[PDB]
Amino acid sequence: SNKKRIPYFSATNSTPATPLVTYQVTLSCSCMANSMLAAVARNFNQYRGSLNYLFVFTGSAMTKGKFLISYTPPGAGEPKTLDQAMQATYAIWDLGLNSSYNFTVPFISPTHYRQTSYNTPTITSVDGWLTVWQLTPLTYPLGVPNDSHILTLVSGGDDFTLRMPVTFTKYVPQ
Amino acid sequence: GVDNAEKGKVSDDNASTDFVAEPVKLPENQTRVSFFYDRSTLSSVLQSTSDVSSKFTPSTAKNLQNSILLTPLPSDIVNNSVLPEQERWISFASPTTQKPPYKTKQDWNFIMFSPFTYYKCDLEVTLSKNDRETISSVVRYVPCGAPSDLSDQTMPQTPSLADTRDPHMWVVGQGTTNQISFVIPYTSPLSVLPSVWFNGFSNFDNSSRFGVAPNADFGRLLLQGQGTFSVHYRYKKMRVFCPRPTVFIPWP
Amino acid sequence: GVDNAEKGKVSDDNASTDFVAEPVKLPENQTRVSFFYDRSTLSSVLQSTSDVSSKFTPSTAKNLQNSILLTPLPSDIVNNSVLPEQERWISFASPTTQKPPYKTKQDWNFIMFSPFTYYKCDLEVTLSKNDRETISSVVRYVPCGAPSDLSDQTMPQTPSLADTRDPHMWVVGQGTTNQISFVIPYTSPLSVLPSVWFNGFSNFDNSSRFGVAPNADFGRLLLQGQGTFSVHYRYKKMRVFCPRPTVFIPWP
Amino acid sequence: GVDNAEKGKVSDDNASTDFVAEPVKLPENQTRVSFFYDRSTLSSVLQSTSDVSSKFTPSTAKNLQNSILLTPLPSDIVNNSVLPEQERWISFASPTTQKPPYKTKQDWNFIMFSPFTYYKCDLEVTLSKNDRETISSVVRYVPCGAPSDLSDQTMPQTPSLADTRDPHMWVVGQGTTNQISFVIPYTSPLSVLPSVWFNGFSNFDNSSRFGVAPNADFGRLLLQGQGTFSVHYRYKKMRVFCPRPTVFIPWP
Amino acid sequence: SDRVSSDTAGNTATNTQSTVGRLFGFGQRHKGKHPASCADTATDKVLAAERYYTIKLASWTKTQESFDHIRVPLPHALAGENGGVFSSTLRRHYLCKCGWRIQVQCNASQFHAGSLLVFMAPEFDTSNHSTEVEPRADTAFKVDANWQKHAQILTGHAYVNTTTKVNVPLALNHQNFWQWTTYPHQILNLRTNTTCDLEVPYVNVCPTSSWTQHANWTLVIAVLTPLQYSQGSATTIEITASIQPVKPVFNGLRHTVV
Amino acid sequence: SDRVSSDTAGNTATNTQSTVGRLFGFGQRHKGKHPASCADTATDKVLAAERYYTIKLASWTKTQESFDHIRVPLPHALAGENGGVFSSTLRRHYLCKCGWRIQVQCNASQFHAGSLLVFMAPEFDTSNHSTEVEPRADTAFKVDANWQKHAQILTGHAYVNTTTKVNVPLALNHQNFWQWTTYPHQILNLRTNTTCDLEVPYVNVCPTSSWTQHANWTLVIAVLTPLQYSQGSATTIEITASIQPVKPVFNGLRHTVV
């Protein structure tokens, strides 16, 4: 909330009309800039295949709730409502005994390979959005903190590949 | 004999159909697309006034940049882009003469004769120094759509272009023959490249320059070291698709 | 579907797990460690103002020495050492700008992307003269940890660096192409080299610089003859061990 | 024993599940839908003050018409319709008493007990004269949705209702027993009839009375000749579909 | 763990970790056979239409009493823009025939109490009962925006003025909720389950439906036991649903509606 | 009689009594295979979308000259409401891949003279050339409302002002119409035929198309010989077309466009 970077997002006893988090599917997305996936992809020209977005619920054991994780292919812009987000590829994540949800962004592309970076977004380097919505509010008993933290991770899927060794735009560490 | 062109196809006849004659064909295969395009044709020119051991910085001088976009189609600085991009039209370098040279870079032989809509091939590039002063140059090849990495030197007195894992070439000395040649594979994310026009936009809000396809090239060549260098393209294992009209020629 | 990240390992899924989809994998092997690192990347720079027929004496001029330590990790004169040693950090050459070049020598591509803790390989070195003046130089290669032998000439007007049985190279003349390249085997007494950090000391009284391993290099290159020469490393038969974090990149 | 009603289904137990007991079932088949509904129940009443040899003209007298709509569901003149139509609710005949009779015609036993959403069957109709004066009557049966043909007599002194090819019955004389009975097949264009509600409209501009299905009946009975006649329905080869709630009964 | 269930449908998937199984109404599934009452070969197996459409239904508060309910007319609840390709294909066809596979969602906590009845009913009255006005095309097939009270449906609701109502003891749209459990259903008990899974085949008065005139199926959520919780517990309890048309059939292609 | 031909597609059928056969561009047909660049199983075999969509194109008068033409961008020409279920499904999908089977109609009499060239061309410029304004999403893919003149496309048309045009000798949207006959085509000669039948497979720079950004195929009707007739003969001569998307594929289901 102070514009500081953290490995998780917050959810509570309410269902916002907007997504809790939004990630553009590009190995260039700033949100994944420091993941091993992005670190490796920065040294290759193109990718192909599945992407796995892993969410780990860290709230209390007494906290329940459901999220709707959606992947919207491009062409009609970012989904503005839950009604729109559900119109695309999605999975409902129900909290419980198992803590995490392994979500796959299917490789849907006009081209066999996609660029890992770009100057300006093109139909071969930007591929839509992954948004997670609160389907039902996080629900819990008394004596439980109102905010639950969900860890967010990314990696290439089973059929993910990279190709064409290159050097990424240099920068000064800091 | 009679036929009906409205069918959209009529027979290929020889003299024997209507007259007392014989077929007269002789074997010949120099018309094969692969053979025809498998030869080097001038396709670009490059110029640099920076030494090898310095930081590469994009520059333009009388319509010549120190880097090029690898595509047979016209390319040039477009609307003040940092590096050259694919153009949609050719312009005279001179504002008055209305005669070439053009300010745009391209393989004139390809533009003037590309009777197909899409093509696929590997690219053999030849880079030659325009004078005989001993060459001392470094060239960096960047795959189609990859980061240009126009960064600072990380170490003093070194060619920034060589500060990469991208394929690069370094030629210098009295034993060299002032040229460089090599072949790169097709690297575009597109299955086949549009040879003339691309009837669409390249990004999702349709704000790009209509007519230019996204990532329709073979990468880029950045150069540092003193001199003017001419570039040639040779299309390896060339394959073309969908016949289409050739450039119009003024009536004699 | 659901899983439990606390296990320390979750499955690698494709679209078919949760949806009506198919695997979409295509063969590709350019991500192999061997292939990736088997290409030349700029990794050092050398400078000499002494002629070939003279006594080699260690020197520094604007952060460039006339000898280098063969290691992809940053190296430089450390606390007035006679020859460059492996550094533990990178510094700007300029005391003001806070922008590169750095005063330290290294393979930027290796430092910026070395997702492993240890590595093993042979080293292909390329040394190139930065200008076109005819080369006349002698280079001495000293195996990892071997005597540098910075002695006097034993005979008048001879390059002291060539006064050895150590592998050395001599290139000169109008027929040469101003460069040298060769490959040396891994020579460190260590089984594998630390690619980033070494959590310990190198001698028994633990007085060395914590973080630097003993004899973690491929030897040294000493040069005499006039000129500035850039150096490249190419990792042959590269093998890496124990995955670890990559260098952090500022948030966009 | 324990179970979980949330499943939407729990087991049908007998005393042996939890206790030391035995099943105690005896064969019985009077609960079969076919058997249950295969008996005659009062379902309508008809009244006429016109003689046999005259023109039939629709009339109403103290809530009794001289024609009926063949359906177990409530029917009556709706919004001044020429002939009775299916109603959506039952009303008291009296504007004050708030006690039956109702002004609407129906098989009370069917309305009060129809635990299904759709039904299919043939209809056995019985028509009985309410007094013992010798009967002299003509009845015309019109299939579901067929023309009522409420036309003039084509010949003098003949019962207009008999002026048809539609099935009709004529009973008269001292040898008769003042009643008529017959069975008609299911004639609706619908595959099955809605037994209680029809959640929709019957025409394309959705202007009909919501709740009533199109052509959901067994046809009509028109009568001429003097007298008041009671009507019974008997459901042959009855078949029902989709269980649903029964009419609510006031708490005792 | 035997209660963890995933269900794929096209490019959508529902997941639950407290299922009590899927109940098949009438033990039947819609198989997608073309209606024998149409000569034109039907349009079918449209993958973009054979998926789950998820929508928010209502907020459950302590004020709802047993049998207060919410109705979801089908297929109309999905005939709008949010019905995607099912909707856009439906609107351009005279007839449609399909079954339904549905999951309604609602989570509380182990400290909340209360239960809902989730059921599917054919020819279940979906008209408004807060007025004596005749139901019209644009009011009869709409998803309830507010919880419906129960008392006025036991003996039905006549579309007649309040004074006439006195002489009308029973209307054919009556619903004896004491027996609503005879419809294919499941119970959502807060202490047990956060989801209910149902599926019903295609039933109607005819082979295929002129849907523009008829909402043949109705998904209904009724409370059985009022919501209860103590000071401090989460107060916002909402009900959602994922509705999937099972192997729909379309016949009679024409220009679109409205 | 060998010239009488009927062609069924879903609930539509074209009929002609003067056909000269159907020309298959590249001797290929779109087989409807799913694009290997998408993991999601495509939506396909939608009978309600595999039909002929018939639209009026233009009026042919004596003022049109050789090579004046009319362009029909595809699939955009059918992405509007009149594209039925093909359109409504297309608008809700990121990607689409299909071929085209087309019949253009135009009858005169035995006393009229003139001929048209009916062809399909991939990457054929469909932008407006009567202005120096950059083509935009809502102007680049529209069916021509008026006949396009020919002179200004021989060397292309740069979207630059009239004075700059002088120093721009060639634009990549050039079309040497003297060779338009190299595109899959047929000729509609008034004395011979009132219909032309073409079919082309799917071609593109990639496996499947992000159609919102690209009209990959263009149906073009150009006059080859000007219309002629004498005083007394019918003066209203119109051109029509029946366009059928061949076995379209859709991938990337999402919310609709615009």
Measured at the CA of E90, the angle between CA E85 and CA E96, to 5 degrees, comes to: 130
Count the residues in chain B.
Answer: 252
* Chain F residues in contact with C14 (beta carbon < 8 A): 39
Residue C190 amino acid letter: L
C237 interfaces chain A, CB cutoff of 8 Å: no
- At residue E10, the 3 state secondary structure works out as coil
Structure tokens at E216: 């043949």
F37 interfaces chain E, CB cutoff of 8 Å: no
Residue A47 amino acid letter: Y
Helices marked H in chain B: 33-37, 108-112
* A123 with F210: Cβ contact below 8 A: yes
Specify whether the CB–CB gap between D227 and D129 falls below 8 A: yes
Rg, chain A, Cα only: 17
Instruction: Provide the strand spans (E) within C34-135.
Output: 41-48, 60-61, 64-65, 67-69, 75-76, 85-86, 116-129
Place of tokens 């999605």: A90
* Chain F residues in contact with C15 (beta carbon < 8 A): 39-40
Kindly report the three-state secondary structure assignment for every residue of D144-167: CCCCCCCCCCCCCCCCHHHCCCCC
* E43 with F42: Cβ contact below 8 A: no
* F123 with B196: Cβ contact below 8 A: yes
Interface of A with E (CB under 8 A): 13-15, 62-66, 68, 82-83, 86-98, 101, 135-143
Structure tokens at B91: 């312009």
C187 Cβ contact list (under 8 Å, min separation 6): C143, C144, C145, C218, C219
Helices marked H in chain F: 84-90, 137-140
Structure tokens at E105: 């969602």
Specify whether the CB–CB gap between F224 and F115 falls below 8 A: yes
Give whole-number Cα distances, C103 to B153, C64, C77, in Å.
Answer: 11, 8, 9
Specify whether the CB–CB gap between A135 and A67 falls below 8 A: yes
> Does the CA dihedral A164-A165-A166-A172 come out positive or negative?
positive
B190 Cβ contact list (under 8 Å, min separation 6): A111, A124, B213, B214, B215, B216, F205, F206
Interface of C with B (CB under 8 A): 36, 39, 41-42, 44-45, 47, 62-64, 93, 99-106, 108-109, 128-132, 134-135, 173-179, 228, 230, 232
Greatest Cα pair distance in chain C: 82
Structure tokens at B203: 């990004």
* E171 with D89: Cβ contact below 8 A: yes
Pairwise CA distance, residues A39 & E258, whole Å: 53
Cis peptide bond prior to E169, omega within 30° of 0: no
Give whole-number Cα distances, B251 to B97, B108, B248, in Å.
Answer: 22, 20, 9
F48 interfaces chain E, CB cutoff of 8 Å: yes
Interface test with F, best of B4, B7, B11 (most F CBs within 10 A): B7
Specify whether the CB–CB gap between D90 and D60 falls below 8 A: no
Gap from E184 CA to chain F (nearest CA, Å):
31
Specify whether the CB–CB gap between E25 and E198 falls below 8 A: yes
> Domain spans of chain B?
1-252
- At residue C101, the 3 state secondary structure works out as coil
Specify whether the CB–CB gap between E104 and E244 falls below 8 A: no
Pairwise CA distance, residues D89 & E129, whole Å: 14
Query: Dihedral angle at the C-alpha atoms of F133, F134, F139, F145, nearest 10 degrees?
Result: 40
Structure tokens at A166: 């290159």
Measured at the CA of C211, the angle between CA C61 and CA A36, to 5 degrees, comes to: 100
Closest to F155 measured CA to CA, from D197, B32, E52, B88: B88
Q: DSSP for C12-59, please give it.
A: ---TTTTSSB--------TTSHHHHHSS-EEEEEEEE-S-SSS-----
Q: DSSP for E20-77, please give it.
A: --EEEGGG-----PPPTT--SPPB---TTTSS-EEEEEEEE-TT--TT-EEEEEETGG
Per DSSP bridges, beta strands C60-61 and C67-69 are unpaired
A77 Cβ contact list (under 8 Å, min separation 6): B204, B205
Give buried/exposed letters for B118-134 (b at 16+ CB in 10 A, else e): bbbbebbbbbbbeeeeb
Specify whether the CB–CB gap between F203 and F122 falls below 8 A: yes
E171 forms beta bridges with D89
Pairwise CA distance, residues F232 & C236, whole Å: 89
* F48 with E93: Cβ contact below 8 A: yes
Closest to B88 measured CA to CA, from F159, E78, E5: F159
- At residue D36, the 3 state secondary structure works out as helix
Pairwise CA distance, residues A155 & A41, whole Å: 11
- Residue D112: count other Cβ atoms within 10 Å of its Cβ: 12
Helices marked H in D102-202: 108-112
- Residue D59: count other Cβ atoms within 10 Å of its Cβ: 13
B204 interfaces chain A, CB cutoff of 8 Å: yes
Give whole-number Cα distances, B24 to B16, B17, D133, E152, F194, in Å.
Answer: 10, 13, 115, 98, 39
* B242 with F122: Cβ contact below 8 A: yes
Residue C54 amino acid letter: S
Ramachandran angles phi, psi of D195, nearest 5°: -85, -25
Residues F159-166: contacts with CB under 8 Å, at least 24 apart: F159/B88, F159/B210, F159/F127, F159/F131, F159/F132, F159/F133, F159/F134, F159/F135, F160/B89, F160/F132, F161/F132, F162/F132, F165/F132, F166/B98
Closest to B48 measured CA to CA, from B35, B30, B61, B63: B61
Q: What architecture does CATH give domain B1-252?
A: Sandwich (2.60)
Q: DSSP for E195-233, please give it.
A: EEEEEE----SSSSB-GGGB--EEEEEEEEEEEE--TTS
* B211 with F127: Cβ contact below 8 A: yes
Chains C vs D: touching, with 3+ CB pairs under 8 Å? no
Instruction: Provide the strand spans (E) within chain D.
Output: 41-48, 60-61, 64-65, 67-69, 75-76, 85-86, 89-90, 116-129, 136-142, 168-172, 179-184, 193-194, 220-224, 227-243
DSSP-assigned letter for residue B162:
G
Q: What is the CATH number of the domain that holds A96?
A: 2.60.120.20
Neighbours of chain B (3+ CB pairs under 8 A): A, C, F
E89 interfaces chain F, CB cutoff of 8 Å: yes
Pairwise CA distance, residues F218 & F148, whole Å: 14
- At residue F28, the 3 state secondary structure works out as coil
Resolution number, Å: 2.5
Task: Please state the separation of Cα D221 from the chain's center in Å.
Answer: 11
Half-sphere exposure of D181 (CA within 13 A, CB side): 10
Specify whether the CB–CB gap between E108 and E237 falls below 8 A: yes
- At residue F90, the 3 state secondary structure works out as helix
Pairwise CA distance, residues F117 & F198, whole Å: 12
Measured at the CA of B193, the angle between CA B188 and CA B194, to 5 degrees, comes to: 145
Closest to C53 measured CA to CA, from C227, C226, C231: C226
Pairwise CA distance, residues C136 & E165, whole Å: 115
Place of tokens 């002698």: C138
> Does the CA dihedral F248-F252-F255-F256 come out positive or negative?
negative
* Chain A residues in contact with E1 (beta carbon < 8 A): 97
Closest to B64 measured CA to CA, from B49, B79, B52, B53: B49
Count the residues in chain C.
Answer: 252
Give whole-number Cα distances, E21 to B62, C65, F140, in Å.
Answer: 76, 76, 53
Pairwise CA distance, residues C118 & C211, whole Å: 14
Structure tokens at C184: 């040396």
Give whole-number Cα distances, F188 to F8, F145, F177, F226, F235, in Å.
Answer: 22, 21, 17, 12, 18
Say which of B7, B202, B213 has its CB closest to residue F186: B7
Q: How many domains does chain F have?
A: 1
Neighbours of chain E (3+ CB pairs under 8 A): A, C, D, F
Say which of E4, E8, E15 has its CB closest to residue C19: E8
C222 forms beta bridges with C67, C140
Measured at the CA of F213, the angle between CA F209 and CA F214, to 5 degrees, comes to: 60
Contact residues, A window 33-52, toward B, CB-based 8 Å cutoff: 42-43, 45-46
Pairwise CA distance, residues D241 & D191, whole Å: 12
Residue C117 amino acid letter: T
DSSP-assigned letter for residue C180:
E
E121 forms beta bridges with E218
Classify B158 in phi/psi space as left (phi over 0), alpha (psi -120 to 50) or beta. Answer: beta
Pairwise CA distance, residues E52 & E10, whole Å: 8
Measured at the CA of F246, the angle between CA F241 and CA F248, to 5 degrees, comes to: 125
Say which of C64, C103, C178 has its CB closest to residue B173: C178
Cα end-to-end distance, chain F, whole Å: 47
Give buried/exposed letters for E101-119 (b at 16+ CB in 10 A, else e): bbbbbbbbbebbbbbbbbb
Task: Please state the separation of Cα F121 from the chain's center in Å.
Answer: 8
* Chain C residues in contact with E12 (beta carbon < 8 A): 19
Specify whether the CB–CB gap between A47 and A41 falls below 8 A: yes
Say which of A62, A91, A142 has its CB closest to residue E230: A142
Cis peptide bond prior to B101, omega within 30° of 0: yes
* Chain A residues in contact with F92 (beta carbon < 8 A): 87
* C23 with F38: Cβ contact below 8 A: no
Closest to F31 measured CA to CA, from F255, F247, F252, F258: F247
Strand order in the sheet with B168-172: B67-69, B220-224, B136-142, B168-172
- E8: closest chain C residue by CA: C19
10 Å CB burial of residue C55 (0-12, 13-18, 19+) is middle
Q: Please name the helix (run of DSSP H) or strand (run of DSSP E) that holds residue B171, with its range, or none.
A: strand B168-172
Query: Dihedral angle at the C-alpha atoms of A50, A54, A55, A58, nearest 10 degrees?
Result: 180
* F203 with B92: Cβ contact below 8 A: no
